[PDB]
Scaffold this active site. Structure first.
Site, PDB file in Angstrom:
ATOM      1  N   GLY A  51       0.811  -1.223  -0.057  1.00  0.00           N
ATOM      2  CA  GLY A  51      -0.001   0.044   0.138  1.00  0.00           C
ATOM      3  C   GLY A  51       0.974   1.274   0.172  1.00  0.00           C
ATOM      4  O   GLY A  51       0.312   2.303  -0.267  1.00  0.00           O
ATOM      5  N   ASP A  53       2.507   4.569  -0.953  1.00  0.00           N
ATOM      6  CA  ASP A  53       2.261   5.423  -2.107  1.00  0.00           C
ATOM      7  C   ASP A  53       2.786   6.816  -1.680  1.00  0.00           C
ATOM      8  O   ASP A  53       3.459   7.167  -0.882  1.00  0.00           O
ATOM      9  CB  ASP A  53       0.852   5.672  -2.249  1.00  0.00           C
ATOM     10  N   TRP A 101       9.208  -4.236 -12.957  1.00  0.00           N
ATOM     11  CA  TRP A 101       8.541  -4.682 -14.305  1.00  0.00           C
ATOM     12  C   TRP A 101       7.607  -3.913 -14.809  1.00  0.00           C
ATOM     13  O   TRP A 101       6.572  -3.656 -14.553  1.00  0.00           O
ATOM     14  CB  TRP A 101       7.738  -6.097 -13.623  1.00  0.00           C
ATOM     15  N   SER A 146       8.824 -16.686 -24.366  1.00  0.00           N
ATOM     16  CA  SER A 146       8.672 -16.670 -25.752  1.00  0.00           C
ATOM     17  C   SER A 146       7.515 -17.659 -26.286  1.00  0.00           C
ATOM     18  O   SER A 146       6.746 -17.184 -26.951  1.00  0.00           O
ATOM     19  CB  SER A 146      10.039 -17.104 -26.518  1.00  0.00           C
ATOM     20  N   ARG A 227      18.223   6.960 -10.979  1.00  0.00           N
ATOM     21  CA  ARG A 227      18.890   6.173 -10.498  1.00  0.00           C
ATOM     22  C   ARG A 227      18.870   4.911 -11.623  1.00  0.00           C
ATOM     23  O   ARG A 227      17.868   4.186 -11.725  1.00  0.00           O
ATOM     24  CB  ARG A 227      18.259   5.617  -9.044  1.00  0.00           C
ATOM     25  N   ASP A 229      18.928   1.561 -13.419  1.00  0.00           N
ATOM     26  CA  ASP A 229      18.929   0.080 -12.898  1.00  0.00           C
ATOM     27  C   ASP A 229      19.517  -0.852 -14.013  1.00  0.00           C
ATOM     28  O   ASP A 229      19.367  -0.911 -15.154  1.00  0.00           O
ATOM     29  CB  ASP A 229      17.394  -0.407 -12.672  1.00  0.00           C
ATOM     30  N   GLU A 257      23.524   1.428 -10.905  1.00  0.00           N
ATOM     31  CA  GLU A 257      23.680   0.194 -10.281  1.00  0.00           C
ATOM     32  C   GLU A 257      24.583  -0.841 -10.721  1.00  0.00           C
ATOM     33  O   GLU A 257      24.199  -1.542 -11.567  1.00  0.00           O
ATOM     34  CB  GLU A 257      22.326  -0.617  -9.658  1.00  0.00           C
ATOM     35  N   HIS A 327      18.787  -2.564  -1.029  1.00  0.00           N
ATOM     36  CA  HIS A 327      17.866  -3.457  -1.626  1.00  0.00           C
ATOM     37  C   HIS A 327      18.468  -4.732  -2.107  1.00  0.00           C
ATOM     38  O   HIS A 327      17.807  -5.835  -2.278  1.00  0.00           O
ATOM     39  CB  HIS A 327      17.000  -3.036  -2.818  1.00  0.00           C
ATOM     40  N   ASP A 328      19.745  -4.672  -2.495  1.00  0.00           N
ATOM     41  CA  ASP A 328      20.454  -6.023  -3.111  1.00  0.00           C
ATOM     42  C   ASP A 328      21.334  -6.710  -1.913  1.00  0.00           C
ATOM     43  O   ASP A 328      22.200  -7.551  -2.215  1.00  0.00           O
ATOM     44  CB  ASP A 328      21.159  -5.669  -4.474  1.00  0.00           C
TER      45      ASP A 328
HETATM   46 CA   LIG Z   1      -2.049   3.321  -0.847  1.00  0.00          CA
END
Ligand SMILES: [Ca+2]
Ligand SMILES: [Ca+2]
Length: 686
Positions: A51, A53, A101, A146, A227, A229, A257, A327-328
């Site tokens: 959630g 935002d 994504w 594919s 940033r 990626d 990165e 994050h990595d």
């Molecule tokens: Ca929200």
């Protein structure tokens, strides 16, 4: 405005970035919450939608939590619209809550908010002196197959609603189709998919143009930085033409990165940072800091050596984005123990060279494992934590003390568990003593510094067990006792007489583009900017302050130059090397060479009539060229950013050791495109 102003999109050294995973921060508007099997209110399942935002983020801004911490910039999750599909991996259900994504770079993610919501975000932050850095992932789209269109969203790539294409039936060739990557070689990991992520084919004019168009839309929105990626999984050649596109237009601080493992040093990482036109994440800095303060797999000697090495390897080290975790990696803070370690590292990172980042929740002592266990929702917003204070204390030193934002770094006192380094910029000093030994108090004697004579109170206010320093004549500090696991920060500030440059940016642009020279002692009276040997004065100098100047790149020849200022009086400043004046606007063109047979250690490079091509200099030749994936040896290939709408003369060469064998005959010639990509397939002339 001053170099310390929110307005400065080109400089971030004086800031303290706060990395926020949008979905795991604050839910300010329940309206945009994803529904059904894609949402998890409790945020108990770290792989669903929590959630978080833009709204919530604004809420934390105006509420004081962020500003209080003394944070000056926020790097958020990719603003763009992600896929809605609820992918399932061997059982577990996943989502694009992460923001990588992408399906449409021209639209926002409903979950994160709407265009307005975003604009509200930029205005809310700007009003408080906070910069905004956005994640941008032009590498792939989404997960795909594919042979299976129905899976996920077939890595479909939209254009503001209008479907461009998808992985399956890629007749346009928007994507790559050379299987996935095994990370074996730099080349292999570029032209091949990352896992199941449908690789974008930037060699395509439709994809190249579109992407360069998406960032602009965001550019015009308000962002003060990007940033990148997977800067490692993207053609270096193409990235430079991308940067060229951003720079020549609306320049903004850009970092990428390029992951680095423990004790990992890639000469390639250096070249990218140096010449790409963008900085990188400081995994070199981060990896060692951990071995020195967290896992303890190296000593201060390993720490010093890194600090020195890095300082000479990166041409603009004061541009690398330092951190202790992200994050990595797993959380720096072990559930198990001693928070003093985190704080020491925190102390360490904010008073060191470069632009410091801070992963959300770090100030709350968060634990967790590798992703997704490192993206849990911030457990609280308490300002009483010692780690919040520590940030709240040293952070603003980047704005108030210039030796910390532009100073150099020199070791002055060290053993196994101790390190006393000093930042020095003009008449600005700062000494940070660190004792990692958690069980012993260190006895320092013979420590010398640049600080004048007099007493110096620990900036940290004894917060980290740091003492007051007594510096006598000569800069010979008295004999004091560094407390166990202690940390202290003494500093000295003072008006700087002669013009001193601490920063320049952008570091790559064509003539006409406006750069932003930052430093001290420029004087309030307009002076003159020298670009190598060429001067710049009068109306071509859009602005002049004691801290920052703004001039327009003179009409010079593309190539590497030096920036040097001279106050109204005539006094010459320090030289700032490595400025690249492009021959003009750029395009990404893939070069091809046939029957280029060779022997071991012997490779193929490309040179040409343009500065972008090394101006015929073999020392500055392009390559070594690739020859396995896209094309196969003896066929060599390479993507190079070249001047647009220009007739170029090129010739290939082969090198083995320091020996160069040139192509026979006269130069091949061709005419780059005024827009989009292009390929040039030629043969080796004996
Ligand atoms: Ca929200
Ligand atoms: Ca790629």
């Amino acid at each position: 405005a001053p170099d310390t102003s929110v307005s400065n999109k080109q400089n971030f050294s004086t800031d303290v970035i706060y990395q926020i995973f949008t979905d795991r921060f604050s839910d300010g508007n329940p309206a945009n919450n994803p529904t059904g099997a894609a949402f998890d209110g409790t945020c108990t399942n770290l792989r669903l939608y929590c959630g978080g935002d833009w709204q919530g983020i604004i809420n934390k801004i105006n509420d004081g939590y962020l500003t209080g911490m003394g944070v000056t910039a926020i790097w958020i999750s990719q603003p763009v619209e992600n896929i809605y599909s609820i992918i399932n991996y061997s059982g577990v259900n996943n989502t694009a809550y992460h923001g990588y994504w992408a399906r449409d770079f021209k639209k926002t993610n409903p979950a994160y908010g709407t265009i307005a919501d975003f604009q509200n975000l930029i205005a809310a932050a700007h009003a408080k002196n906070i910069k905004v850095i956005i994640d941008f992932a032009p590498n792939h789209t989404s997960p795909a197959s594919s042979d299976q269109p129905s899976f996920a969203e077939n890595g479909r790539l939209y254009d503001n609603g209008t479907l461009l294409g998808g992985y399956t039936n890629d007749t346009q060739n928007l994507f790559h189709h050379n299987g996935g990557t095994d990370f074996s070689t730099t080349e292999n990991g570029i032209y091949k998919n990352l896992y199941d992520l449908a690789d974008l084919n930037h060699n395509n004019s439709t994809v190249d143009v579109y992407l360069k168009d998406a960032i602009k839309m965001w550019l015009d929105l308000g962002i003060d930085g990007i940033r990148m990626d997977a800067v490692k999984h993207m053609p270096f050649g193409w990235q430079k033409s991308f940067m060229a596109a951003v720079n020549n237009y609306k320049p903004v601080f850009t970092f990428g990165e390029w992951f680095l493992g423990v004790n990992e040093v890639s000469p390639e990482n250096h070249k990218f940072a140096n010449e790409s036109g963008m900085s990188l994440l400081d995994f070199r800095f981060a990896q060692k800091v951990r071995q020195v303060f967290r896992d303890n797999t190296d000593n201060m000697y390993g720490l010093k050596a890194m600090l020195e090495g890095s300082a000479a390897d990166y041409a603009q080290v004061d541009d690398q984005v330092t951190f202790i975790d992200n994050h990595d990696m797993e959380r720096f803070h072990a559930s198990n123990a001693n928070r003093r370690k985190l704080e020491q590292a925190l102390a360490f990172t904010l008073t060191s060279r470069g632009v410091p980042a801070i992963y959300y929740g770090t100030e709350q002592y968060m634990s967790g494992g590798t992703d997704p266990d490192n993206r849990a929702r911030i457990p609280s917003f308490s300002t009483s934590t010692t780690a919040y204070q520590v940030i709240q204390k040293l952070a603003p030193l980047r704005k108030c003390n210039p030796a910390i934002a532009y100073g150099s770094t020199q070791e002055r006192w060290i053993n196994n568990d101790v390190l006393i380094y000093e930042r020095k910029f003009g008449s600005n000093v700062a000494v940070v003593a660190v004792n990692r030994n958690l069980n012993a108090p260190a006895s320092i004697s013979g420590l010398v510094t640049s600080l004048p004579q007099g007493s110096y109170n620990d900036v940290l206010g004894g917060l980290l067990n740091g003492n007051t320093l007594s510096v006598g004549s000569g800069g010979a500090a008295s004999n004091f006792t560094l407390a166990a696991g202690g940390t202290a920060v003494w500093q000295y500030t003072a008006a700087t007489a002669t013009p001193t440059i601490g920063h320049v940016g952008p570091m790559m642009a064509k003539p006409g583009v406006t750069i932003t020279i930052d430093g001290r002692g420029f004087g309030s009276s307009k002076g003159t900017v020298y670009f190598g040997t060429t001067a710049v004065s009068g109306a071509d100098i859009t602005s002049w302050e004691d801290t920052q100047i703004k001039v327009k790149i003179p009409a010079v020849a593309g190539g590497n130059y030096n920036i040097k200022v001279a106050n109204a009086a005539g006094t010459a400043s320090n030289v700032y090397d490595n400025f690249e004046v492009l021959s003009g606007d750029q395009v990404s063109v893939r070069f091809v060479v046939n029957n280029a047979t060779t022997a071991l250690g012997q490779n193929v490079y490309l040179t040409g009539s343009v500065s972008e091509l090394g101006n015929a200099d073999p020392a500055k030749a392009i390559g070594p060229m690739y020859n396995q994936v896209v094309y196969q040896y003896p066929n060599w290939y390479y993507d190079v950013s070249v001047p647009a709408g220009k007739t170029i003369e090129f010739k290939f060469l082969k090198k083995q050791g320091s020996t160069v064998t040139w192509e026979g005959g006269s130069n091949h010639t061709f005419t780059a495109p005024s827009s989009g990509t292009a390929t040039i397939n030629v043969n080796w002339q004996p």
